Every structure is written in C-alpha cells, then in structure tokens.
Amino acid sequence: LKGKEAQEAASNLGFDRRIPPQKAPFNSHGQPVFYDGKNYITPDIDSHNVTNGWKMFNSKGKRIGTYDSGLNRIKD
C-alpha cells in the first residue's frame, strides 16, 4: 500500500493516467484510480494486505479481482 509511490508503481504497470475522485481543483484528495487505457487499479488497502497489492476494475468499473504486486490475480 503506497501513497505517492503508488502512482509510480501503477505507472510502471502501464497505468499512466491517475484519475482522482474529484475534479479540479480538489484532485490531490482521496483514493484515486489508475487507468490503463483499458482497466483501472487502486492499491489494496485491505487487512490481509500482504505486500502492496492491487484491486482491479474493468472498463465498466466492475471488479475483476484482487491482484499481487505484479498483477497476478490472487482472488476476488
């Protein structure tokens, strides 16, 4: 789970476009979503957590799994 390292982490995964939950000028605030051009990831904040994993949502925002740090699907 990262704050500012998350962007670079997601960028290194291809998810270049940080989409913040709020429009300008409130865009430094909140759990953001990172865009592939196809899918979206957000850092897995969960209790189990493991080590810096991701939740992924499809092009329609449907959740399509919990993922590890290299985007291998772990579970729902």
Place this chain on the structure above:
Amino acid sequence: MFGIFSKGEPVSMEGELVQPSSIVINDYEEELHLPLSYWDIKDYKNSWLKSLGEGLSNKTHSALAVSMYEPEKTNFIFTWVLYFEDEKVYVQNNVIFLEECHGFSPENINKFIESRTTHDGDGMKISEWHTDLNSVLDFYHSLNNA
C-alpha cells in the same frame, strides 16, 4: 451477518478525513475508508437505508455507496451492489464512473446500476460474494432504527 460498520476515530488518509470501516458479507470482510469531506456517516447510512428500501421492495438491486463527494465535482464513487434473487443476495463491488456525466445525484444511485452479470465481454470473472436475504433485512432494519 451483512453490513458496513465503523471501526475507530476518523483519521487523515490520502490527504483527507476518512472513517475506517469494514464491509462484512457473511464470511467475507474487507476494510474501507469512507471519505467524510461531503457526507458524514449519518448521510452514508441514510443513503443505504433508502437504497435498501428500494431494492428490497421490488427485489432488484441496492447500491451502497462507500465514497461520495460533491456530485458535480465527482469523477467516480465506490459502491457495493446487492442483487436480490429469492432468499439469496449477490454482492459485487463496482466503481461508478461519472467524469462525463454531470447529471448524477446520490438519491438516484440505483438508476446508475444495471442488471447483474457474472463475466465481462472479455470473459473475466466479475468479483462476487453472497449472503442470505434475512441478513440484509437485519441490516436494513438496524439502519431504520438509528
């Protein structure tokens, strides 16, 4: 059990005040950080009560928002979505995108949700959990007495 429950005091995360919480769907639970910049917890709970009422009444669906901001300044919100089929309730975790809406309003949340699917157009499994109708009723009733 089914529901969404507060843990401890609100804390600052990702640059804003959030309410640490959990959602429990029978044997599954997952930690959540409900942002408070627009809605307090009374607001979240009121919205869930209304949404549960609508969905329960006609056995369609109930979208439970777990983030909310000023609707005109909102790009997306996280929701947990309940689909009713007889005495079984399927639950999915869906992000609602509103970047190119402007029309959105929280009391209309159930209109922004469409019917249930289990796999997307690419064949990927949609994440899904389940719990019984009674456990959703109990959660609906508890909000109704709060």
